[model samples]
Target: KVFGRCELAAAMKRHGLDNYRGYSLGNWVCAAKFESNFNTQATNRNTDGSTDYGILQINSRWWCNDGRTPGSRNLCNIPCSALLSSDITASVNCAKKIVSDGNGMNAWVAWRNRCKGTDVQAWIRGCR
Candidate 1:
């Protein structure tokens, strides 16, 4: 928990996410908050038996690519080692690239809106 939240917050700051009321970090944090109470190390297997992993709460249901989840080369999963770093710049950078290729935050926002749980991921979009 400490590892994921700390590094995720670090990643947000690195990405100029000082304002939590707006942007992907906010939405991502919203998802994290609702899904795992902001636990970065969170991992869950839904009824389908797939995984919703990491601070972003990335599940294979939404992201079929490797960059979205770790353990696969094609997808860039936020490495556990990176999350454990004292300095999050590197980890954040790695995370940024993982969500890169313009398919990044859009997916986040989409999930934020689409997910019908109490999380209210879209609400995070209005914060900053």
Candidate 2:
């Protein structure tokens, strides 16, 4: 399911994404907006044979257990398909760990290129 902007904002905040890792709800919302447009079914297959899955685009390479990924640490220890559902529980948890583990919120290229330091209130306004 694709979420409305404010609806997605509420969902993210509800699932403990607001300031989850020293980042605000706005930052997560911005990354979601740019990553998968708040679509739960979004997926992208990379040239490296790893697939990015779901709204937050968690990767099969290191996050989810996709079986087909050449190198899956399965850090989230959840199936990749779990991220494609409307239930974002797994996705949110995975994102939380990812943010804390390595490059912070900059793990997603979209966040680094588009959301970083940008006024992302477009997803924050009317969201509260």
Candidate 3:
């Protein structure tokens, strides 16, 4: 499923990402915008052969088990496939783990390159 910008914002907020860790709501929104364009089924296979899954693109190497990334940590304790669900609950939950695991929002290069140090507050204006 594809989400509009505001729809993604609402979901992120509902999932407790509003000021989650040190990042604000717009931080999450911004990551989603550039990461997958809010497309739930999005997947990007890395050069290392691990695939990033779902809306937030949780990676199989450390976050989820795709049965392909050898000896994956599955730190999120979830199947990589679960991240593809349109409900987004599983993906969002896993994302929280990634953020809280000391990396914070910088877990996603998308967030780092596109969302970081920007006017994210203005990006989520109409989301209320």
Candidate 4:
């Protein structure tokens, strides 16, 4: 795991994510919680045969390449395994591009399913 919740928030804040792309810090952290529970190596297979990778559960079909998954758009231009690293720099960069292009955080199902329209402040209650 790369970060506990507070640690993830701090790291993201250091990366200038507190209010990035018009989304709050809590929004990102909350989404990450449902996405991977802060584990960088987390991966899950979707029902459609796509794979979700890393802390954000970025998809192999749209974002990164897992080599095994053919015909990936790989808009992130990175290996899917790269997203599974403890260093989230590349993942964050790719996420920024995604939010800018898509409907902000709505691109992520976890955000829509688990984090939408709820109290998100608790995700960063005590962090500096």
Please report the candidate that would top TM-score against the real structure: 3
Q: Each candidate's lDDT (Cα)? A: 0.49, 0.88, 0.88, 0.88
Please provide TM-scores, in order, for all candidate models, with all chains considered together: 0.45, 0.95, 0.96, 0.93
20-53: candidate 2 lDDT, tens digit per residue: 8688888988888889998999999999899999
List ranges where model 3 is wrong by over 4 Å: none
Cα lDDT tens digits, model 1, 2-40, are 545445555566666544333444455554456556555
Question: What is the clash count for each candidate, in the order shown?
Answer: 10, 0, 0, 0
- Which ten contiguous residues of candidate 4 have the minimum total lDDT? 63-72
Ranking by TM-score: 3, 2, 4, 1
Clashes of 1: 10
Report how far off residue 80 is in candidate 2 (Å).
Answer: 0.2
> Mind sharing the TM-score for model 4?
0.93
Residue 100 in model 3: lDDT: 88
Better model by TM-score: candidate 2 vs candidate 4: 2
